[PDB]
Every structure is written in structure tokens, then in C-alpha cells.
Design a protein around this ligand. Structure first.
Ligand SMILES: [Cl-]
Ligand SMILES: [Cl-]
Ligand SMILES: [Cl-]
Lengths: 136, 118
């Protein structure tokens, strides 16, 4: 149910999402200027070793692929939710959004709006350390 | 903890018809706006006059450019020349929040009361 963006008809097993460990899920869209605004910080954070899954939201694959090409692809797993069904059961209602999901696939935090140093180093990191540790 | 409210609260849609005259309305929460270019109105089993969208204000997105938007409230009259029984009007629109949030497009289906052509 986790459709690949770079490869249309490829699906991943739920396990692949977290692989028994915390992960960040970022909802983004080429039609959302705020997604562009938070992307570089996202590249960096993913550069620091934080695992982040990408979920292209009700967007155009060609544009989406092109987008990550010119701006960078900070996702270890890049997903496509054109119909917006996946976002619907995660409770996604717009972009940008960033979710913290623990090693067990449970949503531990949802943030609507741009992801930045402030939000991470003040709302997510502590929860990230907790669940990263809680994944002994 | 979210500062961005549900789509239907930021853009509260309503309509009122009186025979050939239909008025589409959106109450737009302060700090949010609709994109004039994303409004689409499609009749089903009805014939309407070309809809003129009103003059809105302007918004700029660093890399995307300038777009004509609507704030506070949007009033859109539509003329129903004819509508058969069970006719509908598909109304699609899209908006965002100034603080930085974009809602996906939303579609509402308006049941039109029957109107015989004049
Ligand atoms: Cl394809
Ligand atoms: Cl190319
Ligand atoms: Cl008809």
C-alpha cells in the first residue's frame, strides 16, 4: 500500500516504513510553496542521519520527480499518494506536515506547517530520543 | 496544537438558489485565502451563464510568483438558465493559510432546484 514515486508500480511492505525504529514522515507537494520553503532544512536533517520517509501528496508524479531532482531527495523511502488515500488514514489534511512514527509504526506526533530547527529541537527531537531509546 | 484549522472551518461554503438566480458563498477565516485560479464550476443536467469571477487582491510567493486571491468572503452569483430535476453544480476550489499551510482542492456538490428554460 506504500507505492513508490520513482517507480510507478512498485509497492513496499509496511515493515519497510519503520523497520523497527523511529522515523519521520513528511507530506509534501509541488503545488505547496511552503513545502519548497522547508525542503533544505529537511535535506540537512536527513544529512544528520535522521531517517525520513517522503509522501508526495495529491500531486503530479512527473512534477514531483522533477522537484526532488532540482531540490534534492532527502527521503530513504519516497512515496506516492496521488489519490490521497494514504494521507486520509494517517489524518493528513494539507501540506506541509511532518509525523513522528516510532519503531512500532505508531504515530507519536503530528505537526502541520513547516519543519524547522525550532520545531525539531523543541517538539520532535525529545520525542525522537525517547522512542529511539525505547527501541533498544 | 495545530494553528491550521480544518478546511471547512477556514473556507465555510454555502449556497442559496431562487429560481434562475444562484449565489455561491464562502466565509474565509482571517489569515486564509482562496486562489481565484483554482475555482471551477461545472453544471450537471443544467445550463448556466458564463460565470464572471470577481476582482480579488494579490499575493506573492517568493519562487512561485503573484496570484490573485480572495480574503474575508467570496460571493459568486450564477445564473441558472435551465436545470432539470436532480440537476447539480460541481464547485471546486482551493486555498491556503498565510502562516504557511496549503489545503488540497475541495469539491462540493450543489443540488439545483428545477428550473424550466425561459
Ligand atoms: Cl507510469
Ligand atoms: Cl531531466
Ligand atoms: Cl438535462
Amino acid at each position: 500500500r506504500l507505492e513508490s514515486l520513482d517507480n510507478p508500480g512498485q509497492f513496499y511492505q509496511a515493515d519497510v516504513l519503520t523497520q523497527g525504529k523511529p522515523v519521520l514522515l513528511n507530506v509534501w507537494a509541488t503545488w505547496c510553496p511552503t513545502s519548497r520553503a522547508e525542503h533544505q532544512y529537511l535535506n540537512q536533517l536527513s544529512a544528520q542521519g535522521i531517517r525520513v520517509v517522503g509522501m508526495n501528496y495529491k500531486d503530479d508524479r512527473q512534477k514531483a520527480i522533477s522537484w526532488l531532482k532540482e531540490l534534492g531527495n532527502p527521503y530513504a523511502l519516497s512515496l506516492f499518494d496521488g489519490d490521497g488515500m494514504l494521507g486520509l488514514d494517517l489524518g493528513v489534511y494539507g501540506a506541509p506536515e511532518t509525523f513522528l512514527i516510532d519503531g512500532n509504526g505508531i504515530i507519536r506526533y503530528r505537526h502541520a506547517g513547516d519543519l524547522n530547527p525550532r520545531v525539531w529541537e523543541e517538539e520532535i527531537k525529545p520525542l525522537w530520543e525517547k522512542y529511539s531509546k525505547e527501541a533498544a | 496544537r495545530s494553528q491550521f484549522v480544518p478546511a471547512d472551518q477556514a473556507f465555510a461554503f454555502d449556497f442559496q438558489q431562487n429560481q434562475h438566480d444562484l449565489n455561491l458563498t464562502w466565509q474565509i477565516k482571517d489569515g486564509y485565502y482562496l486562489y481565484r485560479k483554482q475555482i471551477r464550476i461545472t453544471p450537471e443536467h443544467a445550463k448556466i451563464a458564463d460565470v464572471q469571477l470577481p476582482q480579488g487582491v494579490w499575493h506573492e510567493d517568493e519562487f512561485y510568483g503573484k496570484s490573485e486571491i480572495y480574503r474575508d468572503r467570496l460571493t459568486l452569483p450564477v445564473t441558472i438558465n435551465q436545470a432539470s430535476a436532480g440537476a447539480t453544480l460541481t464547485v471546486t476550489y482551493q486555498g491556503s493559510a498565510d502562516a504557511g499551510f496549503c489545503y488540497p482542492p475541495e469539491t462540493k456538490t450543489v443540488p439545483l432546484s428545477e428550473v424550466v428554460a425561459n
